[PDB]
């Protein structure tokens, strides 16, 4: 609701970041094609992340300590388009595999948090530039380390900025898929999990397996259980999205 993994927890190191802007802003018209001494205050990726406002050892979500339920923690964060600009320097294309995987993991975990996304620019050019550096197969196999089954909440946060991953992650989570989807639906339906089911509806629709149109019995299962009229706040929105998506071609 209000607590969505907030990847940046501590405050940002604004003075050093401003100084490193002052150094980088002249780094654009003397190079631009050839590959850095403008940044040495952060010799390693972990140093840059720490300067950003990230804590130690930070790259995983495991859910034992209510990890993706941290509250606001109002620490000012840094603008994102320049954030990607400093991260892109640690690419090191011809280098070890482990550092490349660590960089991809850091990129993924900095994408899908509230602070970064809620202050995203409408341009959306840098994130795609980082995206093309990897192929979808390795990006979705060595993907976000989010639990695939239980948490679709971040599946929507992913397929709201990279829409072409729509048919890419569905065959990863559902590795026959059409009936796999319905059996997964029954698991959340016969669990009183009305909150985790909403994003489950919003995510996969539009793909090859669950298209739009008047055609699916999801509306039927959400129509049977409505007798309380006081049951849940998350049950009337779901049927509105369900019958709105039916009338689209």
Partner 1 sequence: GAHYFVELTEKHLLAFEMLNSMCLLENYDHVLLFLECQFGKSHNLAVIPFDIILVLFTLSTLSEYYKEPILRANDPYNTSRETLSRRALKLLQKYLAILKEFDSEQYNLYDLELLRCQFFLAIDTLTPKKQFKNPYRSYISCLEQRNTILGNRLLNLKLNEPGEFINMILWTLSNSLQESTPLFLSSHEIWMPLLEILIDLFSCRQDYFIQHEAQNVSKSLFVQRLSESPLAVFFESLNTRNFANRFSEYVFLNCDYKLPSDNYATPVHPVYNGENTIVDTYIPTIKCSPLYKSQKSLALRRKLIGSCFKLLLRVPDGHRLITPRIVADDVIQGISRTLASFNDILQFKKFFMTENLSQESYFIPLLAEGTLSEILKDTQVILTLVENLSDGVSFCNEVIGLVKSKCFAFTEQCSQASYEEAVLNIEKCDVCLLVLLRYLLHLIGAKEQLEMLHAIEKNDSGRRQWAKALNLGNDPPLLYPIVSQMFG
Partner 2 sequence: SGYIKKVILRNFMCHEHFENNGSGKSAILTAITIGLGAKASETNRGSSLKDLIREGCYSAKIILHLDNSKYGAYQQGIFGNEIIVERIIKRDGPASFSLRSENGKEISNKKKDIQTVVDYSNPMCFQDAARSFLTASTSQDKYSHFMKGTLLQEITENLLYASAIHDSAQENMALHLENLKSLKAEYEDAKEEVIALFEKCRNKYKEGQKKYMEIDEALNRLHNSLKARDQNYKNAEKGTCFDADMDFRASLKVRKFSGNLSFIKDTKSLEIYILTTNDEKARNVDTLSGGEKSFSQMALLLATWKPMRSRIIALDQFDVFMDQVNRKIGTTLIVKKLKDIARTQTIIITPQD
Largest Cα span, the chain? 69
- Candidates 96-104, 138-146, 163-171, 226-234; binding stretch for partner 2 (CB under 8 A): 226-234
CA distance 136 to 219: 32
Burial readout 149-177 (b: 16 or more C-beta within 10 A, e: otherwise): eebbbbbebbbeebeebbebbbeebbeee
What six digits make up the tokens of 217? 């019995």
Q: Which of 123, 132, 220, 228 binds partner 1 (CB under 8 A)?
A: 123
Per CB under 8 A, contacts with partner 1 among 12-41 are 12, 14, 18, 21-22, 25, 28-30
Count of residues in the chain: 249
Q: Which of 24, 148, 184, 232 binds partner 2 (CB under 8 A)?
A: 232
SS3 for 185-200, per residue?
A: HHHHHCCCCCCHHHHH
- The residues, ordered by sequence, that sit 6+ positions from 136 with a Cβ below 8 Å of its Cβ are 165, 168
Nearer to partner 1, 89 or 162 (CB): 162
Nearer to partner 1, 18 or 225 (CB): 18
Is residue 237 part of the contact set for partner 2 (CB under 8 A)? yes
Q: Which of 150, 147, 153, 246 is nearest to 206 (CA)?
A: 246
Is residue 183 part of the contact set for partner 1 (CB under 8 A)? no
Choose the contact partner of 7 out of partner 1, partner 2, none; CB within 5 to 8 A by kind. none
Tell me the per-residue interface mask from 134 to 173 with partner 1, x by CB under 8 A, - otherwise: ----------------------xx--x--xx-x-------
Please, is 77 exposed, middle or buried when counting C-beta atoms within 10 Å of its C-beta (0-12, 13-18, 19+)?
A: buried
Q: Which of 108, 223, 248, 249 binds partner 2 (CB under 8 A)?
A: 223
Residue 133 C-beta: closest distance to partner 1, Å? 19
Nearer to partner 1, 44 or 226 (CB): 226
- The residues, ordered by sequence, that sit 6+ positions from 239 with a Cβ below 8 Å of its Cβ are 219, 222, 223, 226
Residues forming contacts to partner 1 in the complex (CB under 8 A) are 4, 12, 14, 18, 21-22, 25, 28-30, 74, 76-79, 82, 114-115, 117-120, 122-124, 156-157, 160, 163-164, 166, 198, 202, 205-207, 212, 233-234, 237, 240-241, 244-245, 247-249
């Amino acid at each position: 609701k209000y607590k969505d993994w907030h990847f940046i927890s501590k405050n940002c190191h604004y003075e050093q970041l401003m100084d490193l802007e002052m150094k980088d802003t002249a780094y654009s018209f003397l190079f631009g094609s050839s590959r850095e001494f403008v940044h040495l205050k952060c010799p390693s990726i972990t140093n840059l992340l720490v300067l950003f406002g990230v804590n130690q050892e930070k790259l995983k979500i495991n859910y034992e300590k209510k990890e993706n339920s941290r509250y606001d923690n109002l620490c000012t964060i840094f603008p994102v388009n320049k954030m990607l600009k400093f991260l892109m320097y640690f690419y090191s294309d011809d280098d070890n595999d482990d550092v490349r995987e660590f960089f991809l993991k850091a990129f993924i975990c900095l994408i899908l948090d509230r602070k970064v996304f809620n202050a995203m620019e409408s341009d959306h050019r840098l994130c795609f530039k980082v995206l093309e550096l990897f192929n979808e197969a390795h990006f979705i196999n060595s993907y976000f380390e989010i639990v695939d089954k239980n948490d679709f909440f971040l599946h929507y946060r992913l397929l709201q900025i990279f829409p072409h991953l729509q048919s890419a992650l569905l065959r990863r989570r559902f590795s026959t898929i059409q009936q796999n989807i319905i059996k997964e639906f029954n698991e959340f339906f016969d669990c009183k999990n009305y909150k985790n089911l909403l994003y489950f509806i919003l995510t996969m629709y539009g793909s090859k397996f669950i298209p739009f149109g008047p055609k699916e019995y999801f509306k039927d299962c959400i129509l049977d259980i409505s007798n309380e009229t006081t049951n849940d706040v998350e049950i009337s929105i779901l049927k509105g999205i369900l019958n709105l998506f039916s009338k689209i071609r």
